[PDB]
Amino acid sequence: QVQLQESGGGLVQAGESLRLSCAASGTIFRLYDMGWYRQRELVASITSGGSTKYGDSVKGRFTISRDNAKNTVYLQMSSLKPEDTAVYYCNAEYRTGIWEELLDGWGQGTQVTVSS
């Protein structure tokens, strides 16, 4: 099994910058896709090769990152809008072994509050 933990949420002043984190630990052989979800529309998603696929209402304002050696996905938040205050769920696709199937995992849940 694997363990995904989320951090970076809380109450912050409007117009500031945050950086969510999501580190996965456990029996990990390879990780394929990561993304933050909020049907749960993929507001952001970066593949193993960096082929990011942003949302229509989040493009040009948010930047995603991934360090495979550090096993993390970082989402940078800029140019806050009233609709951006919601709960962020970290998603990741992992495989526990060569002969195993494509396993899917989910995060704990991060609460980000911005004044509207």
Added chain:
Amino acid sequence: ANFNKIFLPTIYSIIFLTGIVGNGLVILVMGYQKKLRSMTDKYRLHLSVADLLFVITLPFWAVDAVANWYFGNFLCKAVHVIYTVNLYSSVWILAFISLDRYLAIVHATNSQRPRKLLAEKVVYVGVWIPALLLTIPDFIFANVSEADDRYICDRFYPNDLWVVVFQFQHIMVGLILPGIVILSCYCIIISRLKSVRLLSGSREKDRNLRRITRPTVILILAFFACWLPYYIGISIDSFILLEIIKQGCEFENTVHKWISITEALAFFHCCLNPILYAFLGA
């Protein structure tokens, strides 16, 4: 010596019993019962048929090791021919399984017709016909001698040069060429398995491919692990004959017993398929 005289028949009888039971059970399950018959199942049915055909001839060798050979020239030639046919067909069926897996994984959507043709028509021409045509030296040279106090059933050549030549050709055709094919196919397969997020386009196809590929990997590794020390022993023996390795007579005796015990133990490859089916099929 007496140690070998007691050791060899016991192992031969154990292998004969286990091989007869397992191969007969596999053939009965996959024949008239008409259970699952994917390409790997067809190849393993061919392999079980060959293994049973060879295992049928073990009591004669046990009796030859214990007391004598009262069977005759025809039976000597028959058992040698069956041994050669099994020995080539088994490893080349493994190579065909490896090639089939490579085709199914790397080219997952356009390989149906090549896989069907390879498993239907090309399999006979690539496995059985060369194996049968390689048995001509068995038909010529296998004979029954009249040594002191007993008969001996072994291939008799004009000199040891033929022994070295046939040992080298056995090593090649049974370890290197199928080994090279399996190595290439499985290197490509493993490179594809650990890098592709999803084989074909759906998760079920990916998991099916993994679940059918893994037992073949285990079977091939077990086969080569069983056969390798015998190949090392015969290579050392050949180099002894080729005057490369020069030592005393005790050295030659030691490598002789090593080869005998090692071939007795490496005859266990006949039981790999039923045991694998048993502890991977429940």
